[PDB]
């Protein structure tokens, strides 16, 4: 409650708190904590949240969520030839 109670102000502050409470949830509603974590990361830095949210997504349906977050020409070419490809397109583009 104290971890979630830590206010989300701005983008990086809320994303920093997302790292805290997610680790707290992990170590100790598993789906709803992941969903509230998904909205915190998506509702943030927007450039750095592509590598932060997705890095704990494989650990955390999967194909659709990765394509929306990753969304470039070379990435589509790499896909046609599934989590590693979205990671390649997130860091580069």
């Amino acid at each position: 409650a104290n971890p979630h109670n830590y206010d989300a102000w701005f983008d990086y502050l809320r994303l920093v708190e997302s790292d805290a409470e997610a680790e707290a949830v992990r170590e100790v509603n598993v789906p709803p904590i992941q969903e509230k974590r998904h909205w915190k990361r998506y509702i943030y830095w927007i450039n750095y949240a592509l590598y932060e949210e997705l890095e704990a997504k494989d650990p955390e349906q999967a194909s659709l969520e990765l394509i929306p977050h990753k969304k470039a020409k070379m990435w589509i070419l790499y896909a046609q030839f599934r989590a590693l490809g979205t990671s390649i397109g997130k860091c580069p583009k």
Binding site: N29, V30, P31, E60, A62, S63, L64, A83, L84, G85
Partner: protein
């Protein structure tokens, strides 16, 4: 020494009276249970050998009066003893009036009551309840009496009176048999429903659920919803209500358990929401395994869905091998 002297007791009366004065002296040392208890058993024994001598019940009443003068549950064992020989004497009720004079004066005598009520049966109900004014085995036994007389509902009442006493520990020991029996009797919903409600404060959930399914069903499912074995059950009953819930159940299940979530997911997407289920199969396979690799390989092989996603899958599982090996 009084016993060896008793063995030595031709003036046995002299040794006995000397044992009495010895009681007068030893009493000072006692400032009591086994001392007073043996003192009473021996005094009454002296009146018992006196009884054999026709020398005795009155003096026995005198020594028992000394036991009254003693200054306690063991003393109640003494009262139980004077009452014991007093009933063995041939005046059963007369002694019971005395132990009753003591308790009315107010517990040790109750063990003698269990010694007495056990055969007093061969009406007895109030005789038994007198114990309740002052022992779960005794309780179940008595309820079994009324059951033998088939008072039925009266018997259930007894289990009401027991459980108000012993609290969530002994009460369970009563309550498991009480449930199995009362459900066996009437087999009206609201009364038994309430009875489980009172009851609830693990197996109880199972009896209760067993009741609900065959006398509202969803309500029961809510109750099971309200540990691995317990998860396994619910899933079974939900499957009994039809297939769709069971895939749903696992999602609840996730929060060795991964083997079970895999067990449900296997026929889930395997028979196939289905995309969310397959991606869930990936999320679970990645959740924590060579047989699982055979599973994903089977899912890939099933397509008449791509070597790339498959190699990526083995790559991810290899990454899991990396995170696993990295662990200390």
């Amino acid at each position: 020494v009084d016993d060896l002297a008793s063995v030595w007791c031709c003036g046995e009366l002299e040794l006995r009276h000397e044992n009495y004065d010895e009681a007068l002296r030893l009493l000072r040392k006692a400032t009591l249970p086994a001392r007073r208890a043996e003192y009473f058993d021996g005094s009454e024994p002296v009146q018992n050998r006196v009884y054999k001598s026709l020398k005795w019940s009155m003096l026995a009443d005198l020594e028992e009066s000394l036991g009254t003068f003693q200054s306690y549950d063991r003393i109640l064992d003494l009262r139980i003893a004077t009452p014991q020989i007093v009933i063995n004497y041939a005046f059963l009720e007369e002694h019971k009036y005395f132990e009753e004079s003591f308790k009315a004066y107010e517990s040790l005598f109750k063990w003698p009551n269990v010694s007495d009520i056990w055969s007093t049966y061969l009406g007895g109900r109030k005789l038994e309840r007198a114990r309740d004014l002052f022992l779960d085995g005794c309780p179940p036994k008595y309820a079994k009496t009324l059951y033998l007389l088939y008072a039925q509902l009266e018997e259930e009442w007894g289990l009401a009176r027991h459980a108000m006493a012993v609290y969530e520990r002994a009460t369970r020991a009563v309550e498991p048999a009480q449930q199995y029996d009362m459900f066996n009797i009437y087999i009206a919903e609201i009364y038994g429903v309430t009875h489980t409600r009172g009851i609830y404060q693990h197996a109880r959930e199972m009896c209760l659920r067993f009741a609900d399914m065959e006398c509202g069903e969803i309500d029961r499912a809510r109750a099971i919803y309200s540990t691995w074995k317990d998860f396994e059950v619910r899933h079974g009953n939900e499957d009994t209500i039809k297939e769709m819930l069971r895939i749903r159940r696992s999602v609840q299940a996730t929060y060795f358990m991964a083997s079970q979530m895999l067990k449900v997911s296997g026929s889930a997407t395997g028979t196939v929401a289905p995309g969310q289920s397959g991606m869930d199969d990936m999320k679970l396979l990645e959740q924590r395994l060579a047989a699982e690799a055979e599973r994903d390989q089977p899912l890939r092989a099933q397509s008449k869905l791509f070597v790339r996603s498959d190699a990526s899958r083995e790559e991810l599982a290899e990454l899991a091998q990396q995170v696993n090996p990295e662990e200390i």
